[PDB]
Amino acid sequence: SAQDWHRADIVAALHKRGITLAGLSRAHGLAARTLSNAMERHYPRAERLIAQALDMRPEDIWPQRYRN
Amino acid sequence: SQKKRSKGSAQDWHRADIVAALHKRGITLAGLSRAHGLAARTLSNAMERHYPRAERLIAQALDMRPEDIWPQRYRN
DNA sequence: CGAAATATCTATAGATATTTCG
């Protein structure tokens, strides 16, 4: 539980709920690709929106990005 | 064998160490970007995410291989 | 099947804060 989730695991968890990164981005008024940017770099707002969709805290998906 | 473990556990340079090493050579990320026809901020993007070309240009400026600055990004 | 989403490598920029330089 100290390791960041793999990007494939985050995507799989969203898809199981009937949610896509693209759809979730569009639903929040962002460009389709914007939330997927959080898969490759630290982006607090995008992380918060993704975590919210999974009923999780962003620090539990990406503990290494929230060390401090 | 001993060589292979050491590759496997190598860690990425801290961004401050990369910047310090460039500056000691009289090079800035901004200057280096502009010198290659890129926007001033573009090479600094490699400090926050995997960007192979930017990594290559930065490593070249330090006389290094990008996989020695960012071993964790070049782990296959 | 084709459409859409994801993965990757490509390159970008506005606002704000801080540090370093000329």
Place this chain on the structure above:
DNA sequence: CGAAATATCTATAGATATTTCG
């Protein structure tokens, strides 16, 4: 001093390759 460079959080997009979905 103001300019320039770096750091962070904000959000973006063209193209190719691959995977997943309806």
